């Protein structure tokens, strides 16, 4: 009744005892050192430390140092030292790798919902997940685990209760190895089933506003819009929002028409305005659209690849907006190639610079009628390379995305190594649960236990090869 | 969402004030805050307006002297006046847009009751 009872298996020659022990030995060091590296290099970066996305790191280490030192000092007590082990302390040694496997459970959820929070709700990410939160909730899922993993020594063993219990695991109730299988098999299928949504879902929404999704080239398919919009080839400008005064200007882009319309030039310019709003803008829009013949408007509800096709179709997007705050729709017309004529204000002046499109000034129809003439002379010339340079600098805002689903399928590849390890042993387990075992068993079980060793082994190779910034980090130490 | 405002009520001209609008949402609540104004007789106007931090915008007649703020411990904004003129007073209202990140056409706004202030000389 001893913890890692070596006596069965006598098949080896006593011969290669003494390589068993040394391996056994090298391995749980080189754990051990390269958890505490690990653990080091993370506390002493003071850049990787404040950031939440990484915190589940400083978990999974110390998870790993916990199921790998106490290996080490549970073949201490047996082998070099004969020392026998009471109930109690075996209860303890069991306890420590319970909850190092709860706590990187634990730990692979809440990087899960990290990572949900980070890649499908970015607008909230730096406020709904802010470090004192991610360590609140770091430290309440450690306690859950301990207090687990901790529950046997309180009186849930089957001395106390004078109950059935296990055979692979003397002084623990079958009941309680039940509720902790349960609990851990649950929470690894809901974790499983968040990180494939997650991956899923991120690969289909990220890669949307993309010219690859588009069949022809740019004139054709402005030519064929025009057709079906009744209207002959010209310089096409775009307007997409909200009918409303204060958030965005549309009245300012339809005195800014007023004002171009008694010109030359409005004969060699088409337009179109898109959305819903109050009905007195709606019904102005109305009156430009039937007295000139190169303007449309459209109030109905466009799906999102009627206007993926419109931003590839169009020439400019105008955006007089008074009060923008991030700009999307500069950041979709630039990734497909609209060359954006914005108001310099809120997040459209970080976005657009001299050369990836137009700035004017807020609330000005004649400035902004002046600016639309100048893109419209500058198309006169070659445009592709201003498309080329807005595709550019709009995929330039579009690398934290990817780096959140590069450390989501990190965290997938994490995932799936731990289930991996701890596949065999759990299903043995679970047979113990559901009816008796034979000798093979309880021998296969003895054997496939240093899975967990080896897991607690290649994690932070994991770490290393994966994250750049953990390897920089390491690079700085030394 | 839901929205809970208060601070309105009489004053004398050139005093201040503050208003608060807290909301109830369920991921961050609002993603952009906003405080409008309509006078008796006119037209609902934007008169401030906030996302995060130093994003703020103001009304061409408020520039300078109102000042909006938001705390995300209790994700409620507040907004502070002062040397108010008769010209001020009005129904505010509190107003949260939720917009989408996948569709920059997507979004969804809600409204508060409105509270009165009355800048009397």
């Known amino acids: 009744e001893n913890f890692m009872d070596i006596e069965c298996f006598m098949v080896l020659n006593p011969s290669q005892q003494l390589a068993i022990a040394v391996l056994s030995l090298t391995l749980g060091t080189f754990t051990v050192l390269e958890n505490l590296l690990v653990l080091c290099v993370i506390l002493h970066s003071r850049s990787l430390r404040c950031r939440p996305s990484y915190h589940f790191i400083g978990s999974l280490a110390v998870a790993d140092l916990l199921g790998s030192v106490i290996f080490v000092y549970s073949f201490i007590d047996f082998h070099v030292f004969h020392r026998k082990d009471s109930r109690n302390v075996f209860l303890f040694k069991l306890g420590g790798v319970t909850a190092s496997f709860t706590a990187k459970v634990g730990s692979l959820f809440l990087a899960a919902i990290d990572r949900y929070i980070s890649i499908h709700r970015p607008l909230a990410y730096k406020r709904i997940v802010t470090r004192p939160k991610a360590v609140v909730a770091f430290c309440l899922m450690w306690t859950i685990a301990i207090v687990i993993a901790v529950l046997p020594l309180l009186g849930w063993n089957c001395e106390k209760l004078q109950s059935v219990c296990s055979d692979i695991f003397p002084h623990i109730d079958k009941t309680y190895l039940m509720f902790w299988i349960g609990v851990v098999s649950v929470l690894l299928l809901f974790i499983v089933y968040a990180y494939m949504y997650i991956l899923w879902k991120a690969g289909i929404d990220c890669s949307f506003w993309n010219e690859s999704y588009l069949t022809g080239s740019r004139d054709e398919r402005k030519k064929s819009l025009l057709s079906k919009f009744g209207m002959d080839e010209g310089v096409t400008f775009m307007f997409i929002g909200r009918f409303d005064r204060g958030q965005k200007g549309v009245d300012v882009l339809l005195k800014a028409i007023e004002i171009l319309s008694s010109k030359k030039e409005f004969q060699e310019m088409r337009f179109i305005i898109i959305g819903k709003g109050d009905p007195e803008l709606e019904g102005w829009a109305r009156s430009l659209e039937e007295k000139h013949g190169n303007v449309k408007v459209i109030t109905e509800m466009l799906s999102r690849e009627f206007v993926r096709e419109l931003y590839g179709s169009v020439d400019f997007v105008i955006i007089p907006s008074y009060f923008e705050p991030f700009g999307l729709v500069a950041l979709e017309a630039m990734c497909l190639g609209a060359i954006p004529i914005a108001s310099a204000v809120g997040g459209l002046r970080d976005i657009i610079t001299n050369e990836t499109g137009i700035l004017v000034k807020a609330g000005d129809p004649g400035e902004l009628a002046n600016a639309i003439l100048k893109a419209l002379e500058l198309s006169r010339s070659d445009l592709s390379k201003f498309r080329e340079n807005c595709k550019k600098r709009a995929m330039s805002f579009s690398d934290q995305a990817r780096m959140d689903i590069e450390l989501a399928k990190t965290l997938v590849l994490i995932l799936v190594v731990l289930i991996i390890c701890w596949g065999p042993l759990l299903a043995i387990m679970v047979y113990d649960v559901f009816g008796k075992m034979n000798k093979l068993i309880k021998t296969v079980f003895a054997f496939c236990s240093m899975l967990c060793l080896l897991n607690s082994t290649v994690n932070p190779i994991i770490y290393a090869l994966r994250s750049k910034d953990l390897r920089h980090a390491f690079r700085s130490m030394f | 969402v839901q929205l809970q405002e208060s601070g309105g009520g009489l004053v004398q001209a050139g005093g201040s004030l503050r208003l608060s609008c807290a909301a109830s949402?369920?991921?961050?609540?609002?993603?952009?805050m906003g405080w409008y104004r309509q006078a008796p007789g006119k037209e609902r106007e934007l008169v401030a307006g906030i996302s995060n931090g130093a994003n703020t915008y103001y009304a061409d007649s408020v520039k300078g002297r109102f000042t909006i703020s938001r705390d995300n411990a209790k994700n409620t904004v507040y907004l502070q006046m002062n040397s108010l003129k008769p010209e001020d007073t009005a129904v505010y209202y509190c107003?949260?847009?939720?917009?989408?990140?996948?569709?920059?056409?997507?979004?969804?706004?809600?409204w508060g009751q409105g509270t009165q202030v009355t800048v009397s000389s």
């Open positions: 949402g369920t991921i961050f609540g609002p993603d952009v």
């Open positions: 107003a949260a847009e939720v917009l989408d990140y996948t569709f920059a056409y997507l979004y969804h706004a809600y």
